């Protein structure tokens, strides 16, 4: 179906403890494929998926230099932000950047992104037009003015519409075994006595990819308010897990149905407790 590529970047200052730590990772869909950590000894961007390993040394050299350059410009930008926000040099601060693209089933650009946050809050974002900016505050407006003067958006647009989509297409082909495979959830319901009067029914979804996915109904009515739904969580082997639970009075289990939607499933699943 549709796909995405994202590059995530975080720099965290540590006054009195050297220069900021810089960590960047790249994803295609919900698959990590590259990483760089500035605190590694002679840091390089490293592969994290089999299908990127085939890129040649010139790829890794360029990626590594881009990462080092970004670490360095983030250092300067963190200093700038102290000025813009009238902050002291004493505290640790955080600068985040995400950029990338979404493509449709046929591979055309659906949306591009390039956005920043400072101390966990929106700072500046390239709008969906890939031509104008949204600044969160009067500090980010200073950046906006500079980036309007320098015609930054047009340069970003050219990358997002061109290389970002082209390289994502390449990765999807090279990674077609995995990136183009949905693994459906393995599903079951478990029963957990609380007392002789009631028990928890827990509906499990295990081993699924991608992460997007669970509801309980009682007599066909969504039990939104009474369902404990955990955040989708990584298994550590590419796949994800999730569960949803409801407390059920003794003898009432057959009123309850668990409903599962996942792109890996041809039709939504309906499940019940099976003693």
């Amino acid at each position: 179906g549709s796909h995405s590529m994202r590059y995530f970047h975080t720099s965290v200052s540590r006054p009195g403890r050297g220069e900021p730590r810089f960590i960047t990772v790249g994803y295609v869909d919900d698959t990590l494929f590259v990483r760089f950590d500035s605190d590694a000894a002679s840091p390089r961007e490293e592969p994290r998926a089999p299908w990127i390993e085939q890129e040649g040394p010139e790829y890794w050299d360029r990626e590594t230099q881009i990462c080092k350059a970004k670490a360095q410009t983030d250092r300067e930008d963190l200093r700038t932000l102290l000025r813009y926000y009238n902050q002291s040099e004493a505290g640790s601060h955080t600068l985040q950047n995400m950029y990338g693209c979404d493509v449709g089933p046929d591979g055309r650009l659906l949306r591009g992104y390039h956005q920043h946050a400072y101390d966990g809050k929106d700072y500046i974002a390239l709008n969906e037009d890939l031509s104008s900016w949204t600044a969160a505050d009067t500090a980010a407006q200073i950046t906006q003015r500079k980036w309007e003067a320098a015609r930054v958006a047009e340069q970003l647009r050219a990358y997002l519409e061109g290389e970002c989509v082209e390289w994502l297409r390449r990765y999807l082909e090279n990674g077609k075994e995995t990136l183009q495979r949905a693994d459906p959830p393995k599903t079951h319901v478990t029963h957990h006595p609380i007392s002789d009067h009631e028990a928890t029914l827990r509906c499990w979804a295990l081993g699924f990819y991608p992460a997007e996915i669970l509801t309980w109904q009682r007599d066909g009515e969504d039990q939104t308010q009474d369902t404990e739904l955990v955040e989708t969580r990584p298994a550590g082997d590419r796949t994800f897990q999730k569960w949803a639970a409801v407390v059920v009075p003794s003898g009432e289990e057959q009123r309850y149905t668990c409903h599962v939607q996942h792109e890996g499933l041809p039709k939504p699943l309906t499940l019940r407790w099976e003693p």
Partner: peptide, 9 residues
């Protein structure tokens, strides 16, 4: 693949 970014905040 990544892009370069020459423009400071």
């Amino acid at each position: 693949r990544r892009r370069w970014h020459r423009w400071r905040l």
